[PDB]
Write a protein that binds this ligand. Sequence first.
Ligand SMILES: *[B]([O])([O])[C][N]C(=O)/C(=N\OC([C])([C])C([O])=O)C1=[C]SC([N])=N1
Length: 360
Amino acid sequence: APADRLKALVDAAVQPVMKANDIPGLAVAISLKGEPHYFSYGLASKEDGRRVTPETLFEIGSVSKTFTATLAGYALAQDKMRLDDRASQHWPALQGSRFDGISLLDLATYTAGGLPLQFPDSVQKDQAQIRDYYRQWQPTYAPGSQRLYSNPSIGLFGYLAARSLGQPFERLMEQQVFPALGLEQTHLDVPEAALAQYAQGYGKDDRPLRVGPGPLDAEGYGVKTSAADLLRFVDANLHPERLDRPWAQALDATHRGYYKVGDMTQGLGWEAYDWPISLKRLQAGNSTPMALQPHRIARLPAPQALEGQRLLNKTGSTNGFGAYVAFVPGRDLGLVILANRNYPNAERVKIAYAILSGLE
Ligand SMILES: *[B]([O])([O])[C][N]C(=O)/C(=N\OC([C])([C])C([O])=O)C1=[C]SC([N])=N1
């Protein structure tokens, strides 16, 4: 009976949304009172008929920001940086720039003063171009005052966290972070031996789309992972105490809220809501206006623990893919939804809300 009821709940949430958004393939993974449950739908590749499984690799886009935040949490645990550091402390090229007056916290939480959603098209994936972009950038408004969701912002946060540890960002993730979290199916650069698992992404007229190189891509949006590995990461977030102590502290650093915008409390990577909350309010917090427009923040007088009666979440998108992760610390409940079409955030949240409501 229980396996039949859980399958009926997840199918009822997923199937109409896959049909309505023409999603070729979708993987669900659920952590429920310490047990994993997987539901796999459709095709990883339409052309070769490869089916989605819990081992299929998807692009998770900005869910990568929670991994970037975890690396910064490790640098914090090691006393190699502090969130109140000026950004230019960690990169001499930025000395004398406006990054002398911008904190690592500002970069991590998109409050540096109007760093845009993307690097401009004039900035290619090239160390000198990225360096020169930051050297010349000037805030539109005071650092710390307005949230503008931004790849160059948290990208530079990750880049500087890696500099504080004295190694390149991609090497630290591969050699230290993924192994510490027990993640063997999680990649910034998918090995040749694993390419057979890499789903195709789909856009307009089913154009094939896998993410191409971009400036600070690894830090902002570069992770490819399976539903099973991403649920292992959610389970690490639900139980940091099970990891070796520096890594427990690194995860805990991603569960601290600094300010509110509407119903959302901003952490490092994770965004949190009170739980329960209406589906419409969870959709609104993950809406296009929240992501694309500047919002004045309401700063907390001290950092707030993102635990208990809360939902922590993150959306992630690339041209071909749409991911969503959510978990409820105080209920030991976690959810991953990975798809190979970039379909609306509101639809991702609709699936998740139906599942989380029915596990409740
Ligand atoms: B992340 O996945 O949130 C980073 N997102 C992006 O770079 C892109 N869109 O950003 C918005 C519109 C905020 C979103 O909802 O993801 C992006 C990259 S390629 C593409 N089609 N969209």
